[PDB]
Design a binder for these strands. Structure first.
Ligand SMILES: [K+]
Ligand SMILES: [K+]
Ligand SMILES: [K+]
Ligand SMILES: [K+]
Ligand SMILES: [K+]
Ligand SMILES: [K+]
Ligand SMILES: [K+]
Ligand SMILES: [K+]
Ligand SMILES: [K+]
Ligand SMILES: [K+]
Ligand SMILES: [K+]
Ligand SMILES: [K+]
Ligand SMILES: [K+]
Ligand SMILES: [K+]
Ligand SMILES: [K+]
Ligand SMILES: [K+]
Ligand SMILES: [K+]
Ligand SMILES: [K+]
Ligand SMILES: [Mg+2]
Ligand SMILES: [Mg+2]
Ligand SMILES: [Mg+2]
Ligand SMILES: [Mg+2]
Ligand SMILES: [Mg+2]
Ligand SMILES: [Mg+2]
Ligand SMILES: [Mg+2]
Ligand SMILES: [Mg+2]
Ligand SMILES: [Mg+2]
Ligand SMILES: [Mg+2]
Ligand SMILES: [Mg+2]
Ligand SMILES: [Mg+2]
Ligand SMILES: [Mg+2]
Ligand SMILES: [Mg+2]
Ligand SMILES: [Mg+2]
Ligand SMILES: [Mg+2]
Ligand SMILES: [Mg+2]
Ligand SMILES: [Mg+2]
Ligand SMILES: [Mg+2]
Ligand SMILES: [Mg+2]
Ligand SMILES: [Mg+2]
Ligand SMILES: [Mg+2]
Ligand SMILES: [Mg+2]
Ligand SMILES: [Mg+2]
Ligand SMILES: [Mg+2]
Ligand SMILES: [Mg+2]
Ligand SMILES: [Mg+2]
Ligand SMILES: [Mg+2]
Ligand SMILES: [Mg+2]
Ligand SMILES: [Mg+2]
Ligand SMILES: [Mg+2]
Ligand SMILES: [Mg+2]
Ligand SMILES: [Mg+2]
Ligand SMILES: [Mg+2]
Ligand SMILES: [Mg+2]
Ligand SMILES: [Mg+2]
Ligand SMILES: [Mg+2]
Ligand SMILES: [Mg+2]
Ligand SMILES: [Mg+2]
Ligand SMILES: [Mg+2]
Ligand SMILES: [Mg+2]
Ligand SMILES: [Mg+2]
Ligand SMILES: [Mg+2]
Ligand SMILES: [Mg+2]
Ligand SMILES: [Mg+2]
Ligand SMILES: [Mg+2]
Ligand SMILES: [Mg+2]
Ligand SMILES: [Mg+2]
Ligand SMILES: [Mg+2]
Ligand SMILES: [Mg+2]
Ligand SMILES: [Mg+2]
Ligand SMILES: [Mg+2]
Ligand SMILES: [Mg+2]
Ligand SMILES: [Mg+2]
Ligand SMILES: [Mg+2]
Ligand SMILES: [Mg+2]
Ligand SMILES: [Mg+2]
Ligand SMILES: [Mg+2]
Lengths: 155, 119, 73
RNA sequence: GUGGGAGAGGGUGGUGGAAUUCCCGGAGUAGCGGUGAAAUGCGCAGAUACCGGGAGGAACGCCGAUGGCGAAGGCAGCCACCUGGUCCACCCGUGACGCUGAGGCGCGAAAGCGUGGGGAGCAAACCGGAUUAGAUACCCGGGUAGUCCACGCCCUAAACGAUGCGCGCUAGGUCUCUGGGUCUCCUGGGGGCCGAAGCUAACGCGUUAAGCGCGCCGCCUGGGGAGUACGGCCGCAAGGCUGAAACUCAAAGGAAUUGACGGGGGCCCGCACAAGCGGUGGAGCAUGUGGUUUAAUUCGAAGCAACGCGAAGAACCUUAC
């Protein structure tokens, strides 16, 4: 990425909720390019958000993704004599990429042996403000700013 | 406690730390702070942030004496001089003025090696 | 680059060797009590050299300052 | 000579404000200082930061310049006194009274020496703290001589324009300091830059010559040995001046050229880093290799660019042991 600002890939809107943000999440759940099994998993997960929540699946989803978005994150950087963990604002873009990554990550750190469940349960624990995902998000925000003494290394 | 309401705020900037001193209209200190008073103890006392906290600590402590408006006086250069100037303004205290009064000799004492060969 | 009407223009006749004319000399000092350069004084090499000698006399008499504190920053 | 001018030129006395340190008083409290990060250090016997009073030493901010003065070293707050040089105008006076200058005599940055004084800050040596593989250094905290004054020594230097002094001659352009004029501009003295002709190995120099010429002084004659030894002179000393030989080398050396290089600068690329996804390094095994073993373990490949490579087929064969 030395020559251009690398445009962002536009993803094919969802084959159901038609939302693009969903396809994104599905791609993260995916592995070994099993686009099928991936999407399936995300869908039975919306079905579980149903049989346990009178609320719309998609609504729960986008809600969680929102609480998992870090607005600040510490980025390393050298200033001669040591590396200073420098706090810094997080891009609208990176926020989403991070939120989604973390959800799948936490979801798979859960106990229930059914994939579709973990995702579902994680999406919920998130909507409320709990769960391994929101944890990282809060661990980083606090981990950043906790170094506010290096706010003058803007970058 | 003693009630002053109006006084002065001195900011001593240094490339090693910033320290603020609030005083009555005659220049007698009422309270003070610095990067060291707040947590910081190494090279962070110099930080613009440390200066901020030191500045706010100073104001609040001077609220206890019921002070409200100050006359800021700045001395020295130093990472975090301006943050203090700002930290005060936005802190209940009414900044009536800001004045730079850093001492500079009309060339008298030979500097330490570290500060020579200048100009 | 220091263009705000040189102090000489905005002024009339005056004895550059008069160390007591505070109202006139005072003009050649900056916000601080520092002697303005030539870019500001507008004076000439020879004139400016006499201004200095003059001002430094004023200062010792107390009519003029050596240094001023800057109001702002 | 007369009349004007500029200047940190020199000497003596006086004197002004800023800052640092220390002392005193106030107010005030837990740190300050310092670095890459730290520590030594200082602070509750109250430091740091702030206000007021005092003492002392040293140096003069802005003006300040690409500026000015001096033979050089060098000279910078302001005032007075004493004193040097120098430029211009007027063509007034003398009438070649001139140039250079071995030796002599004087001056001569810093450090250093002697006697006495002074001592704020800074600081060889030195005492400590860090750093490092070590660190008799670079960084940090201290600190004596010294730095300052007087008187007397020392006499060196990248004491440099690395360019001896004087005079005459040879296009201009442009900025500048200082004087005179009919004051767009002309004219004299000084400081810069670009350049005619010309010079130069080149770089460059070019009316401020490194050009063209004359006068006088100083100096050079390959490198190392060596600015040493000896002698002499000088010095309180440190040491200065003058200044070799044996031996030994095929060079030492100047300028410029093309590269290469840089813990030099600028601009710019690559899955180079960063962002990210999967993996190796751990296990079992397959395979190549090192090593070791063997009668033989055929040979080659070696960091990248050797190691599932030559081997796209080793039971005999292949096969070189
Ligand atoms: K000095
Ligand atoms: K301590
Ligand atoms: K301090
Ligand atoms: K000069
Ligand atoms: K000594
Ligand atoms: K001296
Ligand atoms: K002498
Ligand atoms: K004239
Ligand atoms: K030539
Ligand atoms: K050149
Ligand atoms: K020559
Ligand atoms: K001798
Ligand atoms: K003698
Ligand atoms: K002797
Ligand atoms: K380069
Ligand atoms: K790579
Ligand atoms: K990054
Ligand atoms: K291993
Ligand atoms: Mg510090
Ligand atoms: Mg005369
Ligand atoms: Mg003159
Ligand atoms: Mg004149
Ligand atoms: Mg003088
Ligand atoms: Mg006190
Ligand atoms: Mg202690
Ligand atoms: Mg106590
Ligand atoms: Mg005590
Ligand atoms: Mg007390
Ligand atoms: Mg103090
Ligand atoms: Mg005081
Ligand atoms: Mg004194
Ligand atoms: Mg003393
Ligand atoms: Mg001269
Ligand atoms: Mg010189
Ligand atoms: Mg004279
Ligand atoms: Mg005549
Ligand atoms: Mg005659
Ligand atoms: Mg002579
Ligand atoms: Mg001498
Ligand atoms: Mg000397
Ligand atoms: Mg000396
Ligand atoms: Mg002595
Ligand atoms: Mg002595
Ligand atoms: Mg003494
Ligand atoms: Mg010291
Ligand atoms: Mg030291
Ligand atoms: Mg002697
Ligand atoms: Mg020189
Ligand atoms: Mg001619
Ligand atoms: Mg012209
Ligand atoms: Mg002229
Ligand atoms: Mg000229
Ligand atoms: Mg000059
Ligand atoms: Mg030519
Ligand atoms: Mg030549
Ligand atoms: Mg050539
Ligand atoms: Mg030239
Ligand atoms: Mg000549
Ligand atoms: Mg000789
Ligand atoms: Mg020889
Ligand atoms: Mg010698
Ligand atoms: Mg010989
Ligand atoms: Mg010989
Ligand atoms: Mg020989
Ligand atoms: Mg060469
Ligand atoms: Mg290219
Ligand atoms: Mg590329
Ligand atoms: Mg590519
Ligand atoms: Mg990477
Ligand atoms: Mg990874
Ligand atoms: Mg393995
Ligand atoms: Mg074999
Ligand atoms: Mg073998
Ligand atoms: Mg072979
Ligand atoms: Mg082999
Ligand atoms: Mg065989």
């Amino acid at each position: 990425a030395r020559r251009r600002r690398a445009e962002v890939r536009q993803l094919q809107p969802d084959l159901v909720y038609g939302d693009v943000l969903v396809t994104a999440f599905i791609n993260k759940i995916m592995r070994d390019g099993k686009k099928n099994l991936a999407a399936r998993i995300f869908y039975d997960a919306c079905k579980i958000i149903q049989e346990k929540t009178g609320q719309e699946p998609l609504k729960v989803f986008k809600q969680a993704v929102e609480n998992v978005k870090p607005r600040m994150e510490v980025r390393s950087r050298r200033v001669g004599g040591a590396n200073y963990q420098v706090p810094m604002e997080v891009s609208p873009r990176r926020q989403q990429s991070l939120a989604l990554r973390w959800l799948v990550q936490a979801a798979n750190q859960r106990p229930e042996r059914r994939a579709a469940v973990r995702i579902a349960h994680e999406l919920m624990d998130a909507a409320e403000g709990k769960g391994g995902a929101v944890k990282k998000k809060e661990d980083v925000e606090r981990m950043a700013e906790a170094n506010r003494a290096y706010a003058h290394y803007r970058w | 406690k003693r009630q002053v309401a109006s006084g002065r705020a001195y900011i001593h900037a240094s490339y090693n730390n910033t320290i603020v001193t609030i005083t009555d209209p005659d220049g007698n200190p009422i309270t003070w702070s610095s990067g060291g008073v707040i947590g910081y103890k190494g090279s962070r006392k110099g930080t613009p942030y440390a200066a901020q906290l030191a500045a706010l600590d100073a104001a609040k402590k001077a609220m206890a004496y019921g002070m409200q408006s100050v006359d800021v006086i700045v001395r020295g250069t130093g990472a975090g001089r301006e943050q203090a100037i700002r930290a005060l303004q936005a802190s209940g205290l009414q900044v009536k003025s800001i004045v730079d009064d850093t001492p500079v000799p009309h060339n008298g004492c030979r500097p330490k090696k570290k500060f020579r060969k200048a100009s | 680059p220091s263009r705000k009407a040189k102090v000489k223009a905005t002024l009339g006749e005056f004895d550059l060797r008069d160390y007591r004319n505070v109202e006139v000399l005072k003009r050649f000092l900056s916000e601080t009590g520092k002697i303005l350069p030539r870019r500001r004084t507008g004076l000439s090499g020879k004139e400016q050299r006499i201004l200095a000698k003059t001002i430094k006399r004023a200062r010792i008499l107390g009519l003029l300052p050596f240094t001023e504190k800057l109001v702002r920053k």
